[PDB]
């Protein structure tokens, strides 16, 4: 009967709530009343890369912290050298409505996706020196939101049909499918060891997934509206989430609940992009009021502002050795800060 | 080996200049409507697991690209932000009474969204002959769904088409008046709505889109001069 199943669900939820409330003894703000504030952090623009014709939606850094890829709503994907502002590659796409990009850890491949429900994989270094389309992966029933590489032969995607998938490239077939969300899946992040990954999915919920098996391990709730960006902490034992309710939060995978909230009484705009720093002390976030904010991740008090853009800030990224921070926005420019 | 790098950068810049010149003179439109409407007929009415369909046409040596949404779910609050820089949104409505309230609500929600407050809408009230036959026959009564049709009279400055019953004129202008009231409720003056009447077999839609796009760009140009 439906009533019995609903009652069992309610009882399980109440047991979960009791066991969860039986674990909050100390708050993060009370154990951290002896931490020196980082002080004001002033950042200056060192470079400005120009060349796009419409709004940018994504960017990924290279493994060497020198080369980067950018994707725009005009059908182009550019590979830049950041030291000298040179252009190393320009690639035209079959579709103009791009929403994601990824750069291979070995530097040999790139990938892209969007509103055509298809993931395209391009080869970089060939004998002729020309960039050619190597693979097209199809099978999703909704628009793709993000994609990340594991190696030269496996990839992971998340789509707007409430699903994620693990793909084999050479054969061209799906290998695993992860299901269980309720709304659109908006972002996924990969662990440093590449065995677990987390997803945020537009119903005020987040989940953690195991790759080799295909099952859900744990889920987290607490936001009031959709979830927009997600990323891991350096040690792989935490992650941070932004939402369309103008709040940021920090979640942990062992205590299995919420730790810290970043918010303000003046901020009434959501959060678009989030990424941590090398040490895990600065949390950088993009907002829909034209500027980026730099948050002390342990004190929940603002520490800096970056205010050089003229439109919505969409994408933001940090290097592999910690040097530069790159931001891209809806005004077709891209800025390097150090 | 800096010289080779600079040479490659210059070649890429030349290519990007050609691409920009081509890109800057193509207009982009977005098509919206309901399943029981006839937007597919309009798509097949215009001549020069896929997630999006594209059609191309050319009028007076100007190139239009139009886009339609295919295999997607029915929640639209995330991929509707990809169309904030298009020239126009084309909204098609089945004006044969009942689901007109859903159409009103959808148009109202499109009109008030933050990322679409600067974008103009071209309104097609399709399904004309069915409306004519339905209202003329009189089996179903419009007064049941909308009580305000119990006092409305045709404005004295109306310009009806020849050979037409006054009843169908009252009906059609009442339905248009509802949409225009929702349109001018805000009263801001930054974007405009354009209503039209269309049927299943017509051959004059490209010209209408053409003329409204010309008016849109004229307003945008006049605002640059601080001259409006």
């Amino acid at each position, epitope marked *: 009967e439906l009533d019995q199943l609903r009652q069992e669900a309610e009882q399980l939820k109440n047991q979960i709530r009791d066991a969860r409330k039986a674990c909050a003894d100390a708050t993060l703000s009370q154990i951290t009343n002896n931490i020196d504030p980082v002080g004001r952090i002033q950042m200056r623009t060192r470079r400005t890369l120009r060349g796009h014709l419409a709004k940018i939606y994504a960017m990924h850094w290279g493994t060497d912290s020198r080369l980067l890829v950018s994707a725009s709503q005009d059908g182009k994907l550019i590979i830049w050298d950041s030291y000298t502002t040179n252009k190393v590659h320009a690639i035209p796409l079959r579709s103009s409505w791009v929403m994601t990009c990824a750069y291979a850890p070995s530097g040999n491949y790139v990938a892209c996706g969007g509103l055509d429900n298809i993931c395209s994989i391009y080869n970089l270094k060939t004998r002729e020196g020309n960039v050619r389309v190597s693979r097209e992966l199809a099978g999703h029933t909704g628009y793709l939101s993000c994609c990340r590489f594991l190696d030269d032969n496996q990839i992971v995607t998340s789509s707007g049909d409430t699903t994620c998938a693990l793909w084999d490239i050479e054969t061209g077939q799906q290998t695993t499918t992860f299901t269980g969300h309720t709304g659109d899946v908006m972002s996924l992040s990969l662990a440093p060891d590449t065995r677990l990954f987390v997803s945020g999915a537009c119903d005020a919920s987040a989940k953690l997934w195991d790759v080799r098996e295909g099952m859900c391990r744990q889920t987290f709730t607490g936001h009031e509206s959709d979830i927009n960006a997600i990323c891991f902490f350096p040690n792989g034992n935490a992650f941070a989430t932004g939402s369309d309710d103008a709040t940021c939060r920090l979640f942990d995978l062992r205590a299995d609940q919420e730790l810290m909230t970043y918010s303000h009484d003046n901020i009434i705009c959501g959060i678009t992009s989030v990424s941590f720093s090398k040490s895990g002390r600065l949390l950088l976030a993009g907002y829909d009021d034209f500027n980026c904010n730099v948050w002390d991740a342990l004190k929940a008090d603002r520490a800096g502002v970056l205010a050089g853009h003229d439109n919505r800030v969409s994408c933001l990224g940090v290097t592999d050795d910690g040097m530069a921070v790159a931001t891209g926005s809806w005004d077709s420019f891209l800025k390097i800060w150090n | 080996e800096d010289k080779a790098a600079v040479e490659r950068s210059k070649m890429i810049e030349k290519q990007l200049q050609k691409d920009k010149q081509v890109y800057r003179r193509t207009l982009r439109l977005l098509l919206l409507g309901a399943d029981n409407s006839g937007k597919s007929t309009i798509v097949k009415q215009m001549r020069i697991t896929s997630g999006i369909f594209e059609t191309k046409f050319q009028v007076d040596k100007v190139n239009f690209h139009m886009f339609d949404v295919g295999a997607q779910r*029915d929640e639209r609050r995330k991929w509707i932000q990809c169309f904030n820089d298009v020239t126009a949104i084309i909204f098609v409505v089945d004006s044969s009474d009942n689901r007109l*309230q859903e159409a009103l609500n959808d148009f109202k*929600s499109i009109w008030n969204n933050r990322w679409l407050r600067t974008i103009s809408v071209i309104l097609f009230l399709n399904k004309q002959d069915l409306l004519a036959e339905k209202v003329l026959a009189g089996k179903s009564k419009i007064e049941d769904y909308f009580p305000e049709f119990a006092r409305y009279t045709t404005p004295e400055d109306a310009t009806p088409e020849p050979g037409e019953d006054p009843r169908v004129t009252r009906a059609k202008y009442f339905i248009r008046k509802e949409f225009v009231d929702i349109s001018t409720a805000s009263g801001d003056g930054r974007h405009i709505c354009y209503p039209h009447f269309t049927c299943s077999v017509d051959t004059e839609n490209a010209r209408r889109i053409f003329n409204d796009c010309k008016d849109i760009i004229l307003q945008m140009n006049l605002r640059e001069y601080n001259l409006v």
Partner: nanobody
Amino acid sequence: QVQLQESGGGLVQPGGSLRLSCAASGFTFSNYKMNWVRQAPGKGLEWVSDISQSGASISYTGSVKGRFTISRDNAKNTLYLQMNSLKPEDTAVYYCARCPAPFTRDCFDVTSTTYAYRGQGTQVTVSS
């Protein structure tokens, strides 16, 4: 964890009267816009009335003009529908609805495919 739960309803003769009251938990109550929805046998999802943040803007569908009244109770976190002088075509299941975002005036909340922040509903039956 967004939660909405309805109360009231039941059986009532034609020309009767009842009061539908709905309670919420898991979010601030004032920043949002709220709506009423009902579903009749052999139909889809409909719409009835809406009320804004302060209660100073109201909107009704034509079929319940002069019949039903909507109320926001901020302090007690409640939404109210007074319903009177009925017809047999009001027999339906009834849900509340919350807008997806705060500090805005737009709604995309009728979807069959499991809109998230929607209630379970109550049954209203009218006969004699």
